Amino acid sequence: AITSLTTNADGSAGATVQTTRLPGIRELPQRRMTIRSLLAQGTMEGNTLEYVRETGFTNAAAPVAEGAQKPESSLKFDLVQTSAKVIAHWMKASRQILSDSAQLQSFINARLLRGLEVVEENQLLNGNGTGQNLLGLLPQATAFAAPITVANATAVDRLRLALLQAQLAEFPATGIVLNPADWAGIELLKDTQGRYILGNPQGTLAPTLWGLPVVATQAMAAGQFLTGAFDAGAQVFDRWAARVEVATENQDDFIKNMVTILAEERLALAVYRPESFIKGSLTAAA
Amino acid sequence: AITSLTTNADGSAGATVQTTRLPGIRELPQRRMTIRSLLAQGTMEGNTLEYVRETGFTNAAAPVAEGAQKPESSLKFDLVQTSAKVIAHWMKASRQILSDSAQLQSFINARLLRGLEVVEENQLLNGNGTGQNLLGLLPQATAFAAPITVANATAVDRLRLALLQAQLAEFPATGIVLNPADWAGIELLKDTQGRYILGNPQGTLAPTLWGLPVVATQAMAAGQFLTGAFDAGAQVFDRWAARVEVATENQDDFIKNMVTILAEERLALAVYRPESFIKGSLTAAA
Amino acid sequence: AITSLTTNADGSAGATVQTTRLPGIRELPQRRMTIRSLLAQGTMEGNTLEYVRETGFTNAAAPVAEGAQKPESSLKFDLVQTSAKVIAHWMKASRQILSDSAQLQSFINARLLRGLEVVEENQLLNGNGTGQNLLGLLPQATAFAAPITVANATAVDRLRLALLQAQLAEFPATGIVLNPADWAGIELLKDTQGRYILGNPQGTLAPTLWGLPVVATQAMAAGQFLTGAFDAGAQVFDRWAARVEVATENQDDFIKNMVTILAEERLALAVYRPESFIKGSLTAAA
Amino acid sequence: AITSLTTNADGSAGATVQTTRLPGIRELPQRRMTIRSLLAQGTMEGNTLEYVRETGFTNAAAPVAEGAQKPESSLKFDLVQTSAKVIAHWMKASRQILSDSAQLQSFINARLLRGLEVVEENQLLNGNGTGQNLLGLLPQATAFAAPITVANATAVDRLRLALLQAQLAEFPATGIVLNPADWAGIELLKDTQGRYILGNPQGTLAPTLWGLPVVATQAMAAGQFLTGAFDAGAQVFDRWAARVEVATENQDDFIKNMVTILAEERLALAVYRPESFIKGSLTAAA
Amino acid sequence: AITSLTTNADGSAGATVQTTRLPGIRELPQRRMTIRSLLAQGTMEGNTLEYVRETGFTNAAAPVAEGAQKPESSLKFDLVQTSAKVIAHWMKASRQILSDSAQLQSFINARLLRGLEVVEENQLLNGNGTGQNLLGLLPQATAFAAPITVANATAVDRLRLALLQAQLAEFPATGIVLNPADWAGIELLKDTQGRYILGNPQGTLAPTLWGLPVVATQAMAAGQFLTGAFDAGAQVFDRWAARVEVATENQDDFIKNMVTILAEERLALAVYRPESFIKGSLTAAA
Amino acid sequence: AITSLTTNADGSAGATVQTTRLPGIRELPQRRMTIRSLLAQGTMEGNTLEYVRETGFTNAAAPVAEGAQKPESSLKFDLVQTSAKVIAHWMKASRQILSDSAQLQSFINARLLRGLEVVEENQLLNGNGTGQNLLGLLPQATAFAAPITVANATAVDRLRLALLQAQLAEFPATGIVLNPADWAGIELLKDTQGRYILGNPQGTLAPTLWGLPVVATQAMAAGQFLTGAFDAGAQVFDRWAARVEVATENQDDFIKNMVTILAEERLALAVYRPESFIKGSLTAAA
Amino acid sequence: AITSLTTNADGSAGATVQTTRLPGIRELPQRRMTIRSLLAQGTMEGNTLEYVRETGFTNAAAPVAEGAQKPESSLKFDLVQTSAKVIAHWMKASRQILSDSAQLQSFINARLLRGLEVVEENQLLNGNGTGQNLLGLLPQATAFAAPITVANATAVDRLRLALLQAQLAEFPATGIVLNPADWAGIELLKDTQGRYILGNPQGTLAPTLWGLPVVATQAMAAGQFLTGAFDAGAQVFDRWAARVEVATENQDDFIKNMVTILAEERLALAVYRPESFIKGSLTAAA
């Protein structure tokens, strides 16, 4: 009998129907990439930067008599330099594949310059600074030392101690950065009875601790926190931009009907006062 | 000794009284069958649907030297197709038994309509997908792994960990489905002193948890939960509607005084994102 | 010396003073008779009541191929019947004791039919139904089995578990019935510190719990509870009414100057769904 | 020189200054005497009051078969009688003391009238009943027994248990009476942590407990409480009123220039239902 | 060289600049002296006052038989006398010091009155009465004995027990007076955890306890308290006033150019009820 | 290949790129300059200030007998002197370094001005007064002796004891000054169950304790407090401004090509009440 | 008679002549300041200056075939730095002398400037470079090596060979600097028969040898010569100028009524190509 089969037997009649194509493409998810918005921004017109910073001030001012002579003071200075690194990548597509799927060219243009961001931020936060890498905020900040003793340390108390330590250095903190896996663990704090300190099973938690903005990014290792003033403690200078270029004659690609697409960034980072950033671990690690 | 006895003896006279009959028919109780309204609905034509998705991205971006070769990158696509299945069932009623029960016809119709919903819900929840079956949400869900370690196991804590794991993969959750027994167990959580954390003996608990709606259904085994975004994570495409037909000449039924009544639905299901659904145990089981 | 003494001594004169009688008769207090108003009321005019109920519904719906034969279903029905019982009692009094206290007859008439309600309620609530008794709600409901495990055994927890078990049978509860002593023991619930969870020494506690009304009748045994929906679960049919009648020649009471008074009830009870009633013990009993 | 001295030396002159007398007489304070207002008031015209009360009633209503015989019930009655007692006292004064201070007569009259109420209330509350005394509420009140069990013996728990015991006998309570010292001791109740339960150091406490008015009188012994309904539980009948008379020829008081004053009350007390009053001790006494 | 020295050497020139004088006199601080505002005021015209007060009342009223003699009562009276004392002092000043510093005249006048008030309050509060002293409240009030027993000795419980002891003698209190060094100790009460009972570190505490006003004065000894009804149990009578006299010829102040100033008070105190005031300590004193 | 290398190989061309200098100088932070604002300010037009105090006031004011000489008493006065002191300093700059870096004249002026105020506050706070220094508030303050004894020594308890000791001397306090480390330690105060007393992780703590404003300054050593009244307890008199002068011919600086810059302040301090300041240690130190 | 005499005799009226003074001051002779005019001029800001020098060029250009490849060339650079030096001197006069004659101040200024010019030239021609000396042209010039052999090698022959050697490196010479004594000795060269080598002494032309103008200055030591391209091989950068300053207040000059005048200058010298200068000795053996 007539059926939906598509074989070569009698009464197949399966090719009369056609498949329906659902519109759109199921794209992969992307992260938030909020690190760059914290710091200040600027431009340069070269390869290296240079700035001068004060280092000392004696201030030998004392009360003096009527006939005696006043004492003298002095001061010192120092110089700091940096450098700019470049990150780039390319991708090659044939000519027949293009102009067949209309929304692919632009698709690639959206997938290239996005991939520049991720690595860039991974360079901005924790870059070892050796080779062609960059020097990040995390491997350049100071360590966590307790100013005052507390009998039983808690993850919330340790952050307040870090704030106090940053304030004793005349550098008030402005923001906190830590892993979302730990910002959620903070919501799961218990007393010795069983109540919740910050968590609320029938609500949500605002992103604020001790009156300072707090941010969670996947680029931070689990069990670490970085606190301090970001707007006035560091800056990012853009030498080049995130432009995307198309080349149709690279190597022997003209006589093989292909094309290549390239993107590059060339940014740089400067940290004026490394002692205004505190980095530490949330766990005691006894 | 005239009594109400009906036995064949002296002075029985028990057959004079006639028993009365209470009107109406008492039926078995029903369930809710409320997982279809969670998802989205749509219409289809033909037998097969197909969609195109992105299945990879390399993003091999890295810093480069001044005169070195830039790194490569690549994309990858895939096409996934789903088919439509038919669910149907019939029963056969003698012609003489009808017209003696004036309400049997509507009862049969209602039972046939209700019988499709149960099997539809069972297939939508957890269907093997081999043969004529339909692939359901539960078999495609990812396993539950705790991102962090918590001191004491609690259903609220486990649900929060599941939400965190959902959020780590850039797939925010929207709804929770769990057994009503576990909801009652949650409502009976206490302290070390003996107070109630969420329960209210002089009231009732609202149906929400961690800002996400929670739904209780007997369709899931006790000690299991399922969290995800149903409004966009899957869809149900209907080909036919629930239809009922009555036949009097099927086979040799004209010469046997019988009728047949048959019902059929022919729906189908499409799951865009298998990784956006999390299933697991609400108890530690360790 | 004229005094108030009433002896045989000289100058007693104490018998001239009369003693007066306080009007009215002081009688014992009565009960509330709460059970009967909970259920539904009706009238019957026979000896036996019967109704038809569905017992099975074989669902065999399943997916099928394009050229495969569809499955079959089946139904069943049964009849359930009950009967009407009679409770009655009489009282015989002398003929001289009447017309001496003119109000004894009315007192006996009132008490004779007022004592029927207590036995009627006791039979309605707890009657084993074997022999001449009536089948009550208590011996026919289902025993309390814990659906989920709870570490500590409190009365409110067991009540919540009973409501959960009732809901698991797709039968929501509507009322709770238990002894007033157990409802008073609930107010005296202390923490480990010494505070009260529900009670208020300067106020009173409303007769509600978990959103369900609670009734405390002395008819319920101490240490037991019964939960369920009463309006749509069972009914009581009144065949006869409160009938009180007098007789002067019963037995040899014409040659003894006596009289007899009689009262009878002749009610019936029909229970529809024994699965919607949960009976249990408030204590752990283990 | 001239001074304020009053000796025989020269220039004393101190006797020319008199002494000012402060007007009025300072008096001892007064109690409240707030038990007579709890009971009902009545009048009697003889010496003895009698009333008939309907004691225990046993019904035997039970289900019966088709031809079996019906059960039998019975009643009982009792008659109780009371008596009237007299309380009086007199005081003797001289005629030279009178007519010197024109306010001693009214003072003695008021003192004689007031001194009766103290002993009258002492008899009404706690009267032995043996001899010429008057049987009070406390000797005939019902002892305290625990219907249910409680771990910690706190006074509020004991009062609630007493209210429960009164309610079980179908005799609701309406008032509580106890010593003010015990009320203050109840005020200073502590948890295990150290906080107050009912006492508010910056405020006061309302005169209610468990929804029933509470009265603190010095008449009740320390460590005792009496609860029940007072309006319908007893009555006081006034044969004579507070009567005061003055005599001059009494005994040989005409040749001694004296006078005598006498005061009499002659009240009586009747208790209808002796089992509606519960008496007990607040302490464990174990 | 020219300098700011004042020696006899060359180039001193330091005497050409004068010293600027800051206006006003920096004075010593004074207390409040609010003891006299607690009691009532009055005016007397002689030297001695006396009042008459009832002392006792036997009230030997008892129930009597029909023909028995009735019991006899009795009463008493007493007369109590007071006295008036004088406190005064004087100052001697040279005639040339005045009119050189114009404000010394009023300064001496104010100091005289302040010296009068301080000794007045110190004598009113506690004077042994021997010699020319005055009889104060401290050596005349009744000691403290706890009517009941409390497990934990806290100052607030001791004050409540003092109020109870005042009530048991039928003398309600109106105010409490104690050292301000103990108000802080009361404000510093803790739980067994570490919380605060009364005082909040972020506010102020109202001066009230158990509904009675609290007065803190340095005059009361540290560790002692005194409570009672001040406005009705004592009074202060003013024979003379606080006038000031100025004399020029005292002994030889006319030929030695002096002047003298004198101040006198001449007050008296009358205490009616020495049992309405209770004094005691706040510690356990064991 | 032309690159950015700077070696002696071919195609180096690394010397053609010049560094860029960021404008401005990165300077060290200030602290608060907050002590001066607490005290009151005034102006003087000389070299020495004086004021007059009254110190002793004997008070006999005793009760006197009739005909006896009244006792006498006396006053006292004295003068207090204070002198102005000059604090100043200078700095020597080469003539070559000036006019090469344009921003050194303004920088040096600003740093001299800022270094004046640090010594100003350090001398106002704790100066021993010997030599040519000032006598500050700290050495004139009163040691901390606890009036009462408190079991648990908390920082807030010690502060309350300080306010109590201030109040006992008729010198109420107005402000509190302590290290910010102790303020942070006060924020992290725990119960025994692990909760917070004053701290709030989702907010900030207002600077107020016991109704007194609190300022935290690095000037106080760790663990010290200086409770007192500042506005009316001391004053600061300014004579000279904080002008800055430049000289190009001081000594032999014309033949050495040098310049000098000088700054002078010449303030003075006058403390009226040395007894209203209580200094002490916050830690138990026992 | 009346003659122009001065003796004390008749006539002799020659003491009324008023001998006239010729305006202006005749002065010593000075050199012509030749060296500075040869080199290039420029202005500099700061203390040190840097410049980039090209130190290689391959220039692999060659003819190419029809379809052959092309060669590459490449380059290389480097960078070098130079500092600045200070030359100054001063003189002091008495403010009486330079107030009597105005022109002496201008003469002093001119003499100071001329001394600065002379010292500047002497440092430019030959400086050690150690300490604060400049690095002149002479200590940097390359040695002299004869490219062509000659028989007798007189001074003229050696100079011609030096010009040939300078030309053989694409740096044509522009002048010769040598001592005036050496130039005179060269001009007085005698032939074998008695004539002059350099033409005849009748030529009225500026000094010139081999078509190049010679410079006869005493700054260079006798017996040596320097040749090269001054106009494009060396630059003099003026940071400051030859200004003059006057100071009236100094070490102690205000007391002694003196005044000081200072003249000072800063300069730098840059030698781009040290191989463009040939230095040598005119005598072959020495």
PDB file of N, CA, C and O in Angstrom, chain F residues 8-13 15-16 95-96 99-100 249 251-252 254-255 257, chain G residues 46 52 74-79 239-240 243 247 249-251 262 264 266:
ATOM      1  N   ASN F   8      72.984  44.999  17.710  1.00  0.00           N
ATOM      2  CA  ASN F   8      73.871  45.411  16.632  1.00  0.00           C
ATOM      3  C   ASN F   8      73.680  44.576  15.371  1.00  0.00           C
ATOM      4  O   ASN F   8      74.517  44.631  14.463  1.00  0.00           O
ATOM      5  N   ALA F   9      72.600  43.806  15.294  1.00  0.00           N
ATOM      6  CA  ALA F   9      72.335  42.979  14.126  1.00  0.00           C
ATOM      7  C   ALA F   9      71.726  43.841  13.023  1.00  0.00           C
ATOM      8  O   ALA F   9      71.520  45.047  13.182  1.00  0.00           O
ATOM      9  N   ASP F  10      71.428  43.227  11.884  1.00  0.00           N
ATOM     10  CA  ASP F  10      70.845  43.938  10.756  1.00  0.00           C
ATOM     11  C   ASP F  10      69.338  44.039  10.938  1.00  0.00           C
ATOM     12  O   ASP F  10      68.707  43.144  11.508  1.00  0.00           O
ATOM     13  N   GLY F  11      68.764  45.134  10.449  1.00  0.00           N
ATOM     14  CA  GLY F  11      67.341  45.368  10.584  1.00  0.00           C
ATOM     15  C   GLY F  11      66.899  45.576  12.016  1.00  0.00           C
ATOM     16  O   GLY F  11      65.843  45.080  12.419  1.00  0.00           O
ATOM     17  N   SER F  12      67.692  46.307  12.799  1.00  0.00           N
ATOM     18  CA  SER F  12      67.331  46.546  14.192  1.00  0.00           C
ATOM     19  C   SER F  12      66.336  47.695  14.313  1.00  0.00           C
ATOM     20  O   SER F  12      65.186  47.489  14.712  1.00  0.00           O
ATOM     21  N   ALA F  13      66.765  48.909  13.964  1.00  0.00           N
ATOM     22  CA  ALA F  13      65.888  50.081  13.873  1.00  0.00           C
ATOM     23  C   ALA F  13      65.026  50.269  15.121  1.00  0.00           C
ATOM     24  O   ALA F  13      63.919  50.809  15.060  1.00  0.00           O
ATOM     25  N   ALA F  15      65.863  52.057  17.779  1.00  0.00           N
ATOM     26  CA  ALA F  15      66.164  53.321  18.436  1.00  0.00           C
ATOM     27  C   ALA F  15      65.345  54.487  17.902  1.00  0.00           C
ATOM     28  O   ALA F  15      65.456  55.595  18.434  1.00  0.00           O
ATOM     29  N   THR F  16      64.529  54.271  16.874  1.00  0.00           N
ATOM     30  CA  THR F  16      63.758  55.350  16.270  1.00  0.00           C
ATOM     31  C   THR F  16      62.453  55.635  17.000  1.00  0.00           C
ATOM     32  O   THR F  16      61.738  56.565  16.611  1.00  0.00           O
ATOM     33  N   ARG F  95      69.429  75.695  41.478  1.00  0.00           N
ATOM     34  CA  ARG F  95      68.914  76.570  40.434  1.00  0.00           C
ATOM     35  C   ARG F  95      68.830  75.867  39.086  1.00  0.00           C
ATOM     36  O   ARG F  95      67.996  76.243  38.257  1.00  0.00           O
ATOM     37  N   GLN F  96      69.667  74.854  38.852  1.00  0.00           N
ATOM     38  CA  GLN F  96      69.582  74.091  37.611  1.00  0.00           C
ATOM     39  C   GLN F  96      68.309  73.254  37.562  1.00  0.00           C
ATOM     40  O   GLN F  96      67.622  73.216  36.536  1.00  0.00           O
ATOM     41  N   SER F  99      63.512  75.438  36.566  1.00  0.00           N
ATOM     42  CA  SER F  99      63.429  75.867  35.172  1.00  0.00           C
ATOM     43  C   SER F  99      63.688  74.728  34.195  1.00  0.00           C
ATOM     44  O   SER F  99      63.499  74.915  32.988  1.00  0.00           O
ATOM     45  N   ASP F 100      64.105  73.553  34.669  1.00  0.00           N
ATOM     46  CA  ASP F 100      64.058  72.341  33.865  1.00  0.00           C
ATOM     47  C   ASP F 100      62.784  71.548  34.091  1.00  0.00           C
ATOM     48  O   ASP F 100      62.129  71.163  33.116  1.00  0.00           O
ATOM     49  N   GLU F 249      69.031  84.870  47.878  1.00  0.00           N
ATOM     50  CA  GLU F 249      70.319  85.418  48.291  1.00  0.00           C
ATOM     51  C   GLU F 249      70.666  85.080  49.738  1.00  0.00           C
ATOM     52  O   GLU F 249      71.582  85.692  50.300  1.00  0.00           O
ATOM     53  N   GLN F 251      72.502  83.652  52.700  1.00  0.00           N
ATOM     54  CA  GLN F 251      73.897  83.239  52.830  1.00  0.00           C
ATOM     55  C   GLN F 251      74.624  83.347  51.497  1.00  0.00           C
ATOM     56  O   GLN F 251      74.403  84.298  50.739  1.00  0.00           O
ATOM     57  N   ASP F 252      75.488  82.384  51.202  1.00  0.00           N
ATOM     58  CA  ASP F 252      76.203  82.341  49.925  1.00  0.00           C
ATOM     59  C   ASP F 252      75.473  81.476  48.905  1.00  0.00           C
ATOM     60  O   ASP F 252      76.058  80.586  48.291  1.00  0.00           O
ATOM     61  N   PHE F 254      73.951  82.923  46.265  1.00  0.00           N
ATOM     62  CA  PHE F 254      74.050  83.583  44.970  1.00  0.00           C
ATOM     63  C   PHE F 254      75.271  83.099  44.202  1.00  0.00           C
ATOM     64  O   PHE F 254      75.227  82.960  42.975  1.00  0.00           O
ATOM     65  N   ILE F 255      76.373  82.832  44.910  1.00  0.00           N
ATOM     66  CA  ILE F 255      77.581  82.322  44.269  1.00  0.00           C
ATOM     67  C   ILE F 255      77.605  80.803  44.193  1.00  0.00           C
ATOM     68  O   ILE F 255      78.599  80.232  43.721  1.00  0.00           O
ATOM     69  N   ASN F 257      74.448  79.218  43.206  1.00  0.00           N
ATOM     70  CA  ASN F 257      73.278  78.954  42.369  1.00  0.00           C
ATOM     71  C   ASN F 257      72.273  78.054  43.093  1.00  0.00           C
ATOM     72  O   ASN F 257      71.969  76.939  42.667  1.00  0.00           O
TER      73      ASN F 257
ATOM     74  N   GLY G  46      66.034  71.397  28.543  1.00  0.00           N
ATOM     75  CA  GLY G  46      66.344  70.316  29.458  1.00  0.00           C
ATOM     76  C   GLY G  46      67.794  70.312  29.891  1.00  0.00           C
ATOM     77  O   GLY G  46      68.420  71.371  29.991  1.00  0.00           O
ATOM     78  N   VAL G  52      69.306  60.065  16.999  1.00  0.00           N
ATOM     79  CA  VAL G  52      69.374  58.772  16.329  1.00  0.00           C
ATOM     80  C   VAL G  52      70.347  58.867  15.165  1.00  0.00           C
ATOM     81  O   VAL G  52      70.297  59.812  14.368  1.00  0.00           O
ATOM     82  N   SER G  74      67.338  46.242   3.687  1.00  0.00           N
ATOM     83  CA  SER G  74      67.354  46.403   5.144  1.00  0.00           C
ATOM     84  C   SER G  74      68.284  47.523   5.610  1.00  0.00           C
ATOM     85  O   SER G  74      69.116  48.014   4.840  1.00  0.00           O
ATOM     86  N   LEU G  75      68.149  47.928   6.872  1.00  0.00           N
ATOM     87  CA  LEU G  75      68.903  49.040   7.452  1.00  0.00           C
ATOM     88  C   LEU G  75      69.229  48.703   8.904  1.00  0.00           C
ATOM     89  O   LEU G  75      69.036  47.570   9.351  1.00  0.00           O
ATOM     90  N   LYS G  76      69.730  49.694   9.643  1.00  0.00           N
ATOM     91  CA  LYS G  76      69.910  49.601  11.090  1.00  0.00           C
ATOM     92  C   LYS G  76      70.291  50.972  11.632  1.00  0.00           C
ATOM     93  O   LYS G  76      70.896  51.783  10.927  1.00  0.00           O
ATOM     94  N   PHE G  77      69.926  51.220  12.892  1.00  0.00           N
ATOM     95  CA  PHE G  77      70.102  52.517  13.537  1.00  0.00           C
ATOM     96  C   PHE G  77      70.634  52.319  14.955  1.00  0.00           C
ATOM     97  O   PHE G  77      70.765  51.194  15.443  1.00  0.00           O
ATOM     98  N   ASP G  78      70.939  53.435  15.618  1.00  0.00           N
ATOM     99  CA  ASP G  78      71.225  53.439  17.050  1.00  0.00           C
ATOM    100  C   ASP G  78      70.935  54.832  17.595  1.00  0.00           C
ATOM    101  O   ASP G  78      70.574  55.744  16.851  1.00  0.00           O
ATOM    102  N   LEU G  79      71.097  54.988  18.909  1.00  0.00           N
ATOM    103  CA  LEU G  79      70.766  56.231  19.595  1.00  0.00           C
ATOM    104  C   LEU G  79      71.876  56.596  20.568  1.00  0.00           C
ATOM    105  O   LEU G  79      72.413  55.723  21.257  1.00  0.00           O
ATOM    106  N   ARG G 239      71.369  76.244  25.944  1.00  0.00           N
ATOM    107  CA  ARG G 239      70.266  76.099  26.884  1.00  0.00           C
ATOM    108  C   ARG G 239      69.938  77.430  27.551  1.00  0.00           C
ATOM    109  O   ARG G 239      68.833  77.956  27.394  1.00  0.00           O
ATOM    110  N   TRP G 240      70.887  77.984  28.292  1.00  0.00           N
ATOM    111  CA  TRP G 240      70.791  79.338  28.809  1.00  0.00           C
ATOM    112  C   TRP G 240      71.569  80.275  27.886  1.00  0.00           C
ATOM    113  O   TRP G 240      71.985  79.898  26.788  1.00  0.00           O
ATOM    114  N   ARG G 243      73.484  85.956  30.132  1.00  0.00           N
ATOM    115  CA  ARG G 243      72.910  87.032  30.927  1.00  0.00           C
ATOM    116  C   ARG G 243      73.799  87.363  32.123  1.00  0.00           C
ATOM    117  O   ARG G 243      74.710  86.613  32.488  1.00  0.00           O
ATOM    118  N   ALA G 247      73.603  91.307  42.587  1.00  0.00           N
ATOM    119  CA  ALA G 247      73.112  91.015  43.931  1.00  0.00           C
ATOM    120  C   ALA G 247      73.679  92.051  44.889  1.00  0.00           C
ATOM    121  O   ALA G 247      74.901  92.232  44.964  1.00  0.00           O
ATOM    122  N   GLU G 249      72.443  92.115  48.322  1.00  0.00           N
ATOM    123  CA  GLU G 249      72.478  91.390  49.584  1.00  0.00           C
ATOM    124  C   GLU G 249      73.127  90.033  49.355  1.00  0.00           C
ATOM    125  O   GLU G 249      72.695  89.271  48.484  1.00  0.00           O
ATOM    126  N   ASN G 250      74.157  89.740  50.134  1.00  0.00           N
ATOM    127  CA  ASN G 250      74.972  88.546  49.954  1.00  0.00           C
ATOM    128  C   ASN G 250      75.469  88.121  51.330  1.00  0.00           C
ATOM    129  O   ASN G 250      74.863  88.470  52.348  1.00  0.00           O
ATOM    130  N   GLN G 251      76.548  87.331  51.356  1.00  0.00           N
ATOM    131  CA  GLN G 251      77.090  86.785  52.596  1.00  0.00           C
ATOM    132  C   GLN G 251      77.106  87.815  53.718  1.00  0.00           C
ATOM    133  O   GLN G 251      76.421  87.658  54.736  1.00  0.00           O
ATOM    134  N   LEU G 262      77.364  88.668  38.677  1.00  0.00           N
ATOM    135  CA  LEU G 262      77.559  87.290  38.251  1.00  0.00           C
ATOM    136  C   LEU G 262      77.237  87.151  36.771  1.00  0.00           C
ATOM    137  O   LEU G 262      76.270  87.744  36.280  1.00  0.00           O
ATOM    138  N   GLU G 264      76.890  83.930  33.846  1.00  0.00           N
ATOM    139  CA  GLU G 264      76.720  82.486  33.823  1.00  0.00           C
ATOM    140  C   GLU G 264      76.101  82.067  32.496  1.00  0.00           C
ATOM    141  O   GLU G 264      75.391  82.838  31.846  1.00  0.00           O
ATOM    142  N   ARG G 266      74.975  78.187  30.140  1.00  0.00           N
ATOM    143  CA  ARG G 266      74.924  76.744  29.946  1.00  0.00           C
ATOM    144  C   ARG G 266      74.998  76.426  28.462  1.00  0.00           C
ATOM    145  O   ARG G 266      74.393  77.121  27.640  1.00  0.00           O
TER     146      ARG G 266
END
